[PDB]
């Protein structure tokens, strides 16, 4: 029960990642909610994991976001239908994929007169969807944020070495 710490609230990861992915696209999320404890090292590890994940699933990401944006006003139900298979139950893979995808779509919605106003809802859906799945599925599945960092640094290094090859 470490994902219960206020320091690691899911919102913190979603907000920090959305902000980072949007800035990566040269834009600025003016409506971004505050980060009570500020950037956490686990956030900075989520930035890398999301970047790596996006690069690996870019094509499928294009499809899912076009599905999610098929309807002007995004609903929680539609969100769940589109995100059902992201990260092919809340493993680190699905976790990273959900945040990565959320950040990806948010960046597509930014500076869009009709879409910009739903980046906040995307943030909430993402945070809520992950909250549930984690709370009731992480204790039994034996996962945690600490276990996350261990696997993360490994993936961070592989990527670095791989791209440097």
UniProtKB/Swiss-Prot annotation:
The keyword Aminoacyl-tRNA synthetase does not apply. One of its GO terms (cellular component) is membrane. GO terms for biological process: actin filament depolymerization; apoptotic process; apoptotic process involved in development; defense response to Gram-negative bacterium; extrinsic apoptotic signaling pathway in absence of ligand; intrinsic apoptotic signaling pathway in response to DNA damage; mitophagy; negative regulation of apoptotic process. A motif (BH2) lies at residues 137-153. The keyword Nucleotide-binding does not apply. Transmembrane segments: none annotated. It is a peripheral membrane protein. It is found in: Perikaryon; Synapse; Endomembrane system; Mitochondrion membrane. A motif (BH4) lies at residues 10-29. Interacts with asymmetric homodimer ced-4; the interaction sequesters ced-4. Interacts with egl-1; the interaction results in ced-4 release. Interacts with dre-1; the interaction inhibits ced-9 activity, either directly or indirectly. Interacts with dct-1. May form a complex composed of ced-9, ced-4 and mac-1. Interacts with dynamin-related protein drp-1 (via residues 280-502); the interaction is enhanced by GTP rather than GDP; the interaction is probably direct and may occur at the mitochondrion. Interaction with drp-1 may be enhanced by interaction of ced-9 with egl-1, but not with ced-4. Plays a major role in programmed cell death (PCD, apoptosis). egl-1 binds to and directly inhibits the activity of ced-9, releasing the cell death activator ced-4 from a ced-9/ced-4 containing protein complex and allowing ced-4 to activate the cell-killing caspase ced-3. During larval development, required for the elimination of transient presynaptic components downstream of egl-1 and upstream of ced-4 and ced-3 apoptotic pathway. Has been shown in one study to be dispensable in mitochondrial dynamics and morphology during early embryonic development. This is Apoptosis regulator ced-9. The chain holds residues 71 to 241 of 280 of the full protein.
